[PDB]
Symmetry: D2
Subunit: 113 residues, 4 copies
Amino acid sequence: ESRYVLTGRYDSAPATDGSGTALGWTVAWKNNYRNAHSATTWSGQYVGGAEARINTQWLLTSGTTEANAWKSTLVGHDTFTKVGITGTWYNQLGSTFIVTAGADGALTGTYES
Amino acid sequence: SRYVLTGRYDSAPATDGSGTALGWTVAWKNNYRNAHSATTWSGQYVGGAEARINTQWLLTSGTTEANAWKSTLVGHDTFTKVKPSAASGGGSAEAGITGTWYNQLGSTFIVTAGADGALTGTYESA
Amino acid sequence: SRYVLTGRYDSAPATDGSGTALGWTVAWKNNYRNAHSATTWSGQYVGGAEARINTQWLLTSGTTEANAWKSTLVGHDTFTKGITGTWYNQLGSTFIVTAGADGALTGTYESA
Amino acid sequence: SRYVLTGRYDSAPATDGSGTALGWTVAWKNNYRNAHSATTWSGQYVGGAEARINTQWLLTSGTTEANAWKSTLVGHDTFTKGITGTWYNQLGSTFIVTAGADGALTGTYESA
Ligand SMILES: O=C(O)CCCC[C@@H]1SC[C@@H]2NC(=O)N[C@@H]21
Ligand SMILES: O=C(O)CCCC[C@@H]1SC[C@@H]2NC(=O)N[C@@H]21
Ligand SMILES: O=C(O)CCCC[C@@H]1SC[C@@H]2NC(=O)N[C@@H]21
Ligand SMILES: O=C(O)CCCC[C@@H]1SC[C@@H]2NC(=O)N[C@@H]21
């Protein structure tokens, strides 16, 4: 019930100069049980090493009438650590991110809030 | 040139007049170029008299840690539907979203909405 | 109704056709109401036949730590009426501002 | 190396445990340098043992129309030391502020 489909993209040929790896993904907050009529997108980068991390900023847009569109979108920032990109990650809110990074640049997985 | 996109949309939107929430991502790598960055668009599909996809976006570039404070640009794009621009409105979000769109910069957004929440297609910035 | 705003702007902008960087804050408290929140507009002034102030804004409400993840709204406002004057945006809010030689912005904001 | 800041904050915040909404602006010009940009920080003050100011910010650079699409950076800064005082963020930047009884924020900012 708390898990939702995610899909995204990442730079499958990142710079070799110490730069992180650019990526982003989306969750539409509808599953077979619940629907919040909203979607969040996370835009960020993967930073490998001992303390592998995914540092992001996100936009959460809710479906609204035109009259309420001015307040349709929340903005925030999430940092994820692994429990490379493929794997199970957790953020500071305790949300769980299960992800697979295809060789073609695709991000597929699930998110649980 | 053209880059793959993938994303998600609310496949059972509200019926109270609210728009349909959606989002998608482009990694700016194809087989010809790589900008080492990705943009995510978060927004909603609005139907009716003036169909639009209204978005805010975040463009994150790969950077060193010292430069991570400035890795992300923010902006907003409004998309107008050009193929087909004419619609009765039947088909719900899938029909409303599916097709070719252009934003205020003249970029081209070609997307298919289906399979209960999936968005696929191509993006071409101007 | 009306709220105090204060801000800053680049008092010596490039002359290469670039706009003038600026920003201002409204804390949504006046004598009669308090939404326990503040909006900041970050943007640029573009002078011309039809002068414009193009902005992105962040609206942070005071929240508990538990609700801090959803404390901040983001959006964009475009204002129509160099900087000194009365402007209105696409929601019909009224921005009344004075640009000082020091880079200061002072005025009042009234949201539709 | 310092730049003037001005802003606003909620001078009568909720008493429910909520933080204090605030915002401020820096136009990046002083008497020695001008980056032709402005940053606005929007966020809230959280009192207590370890007080903090948690923010999101927008840095808008003056640009020509063609470059306007990339005019604005977005980020988040967390400051540690009431609001009046000397604060530093996670970059090592220094924020020196005075919170006025009228809801004003006045001070100087120095980026790392
Ligand atoms: O309230 C909704 O509309 C759905 C819940 C979304 C939870 C958000 S997405 C950004 C942030 N990061 C998380 O892990 N959870 C919140
Ligand atoms: O410069 C890059 O790193 C890749 C190109 C980014 C183009 C951006 S994405 C947001 C905005 N909307 C568009 O249609 N184009 C720009
Ligand atoms: O609701 C609040 O917490 C205070 C009113 C906020 C109105 C917002 S500020 C950004 C946007 N631009 C406007 O003119 N109005 C809204
Ligand atoms: O070069 C500029 O355009 C002006 C200096 C910008 C420094 C930025 S403001 C946001 C972030 N937080 C800081 O302490 N420094 C950077």
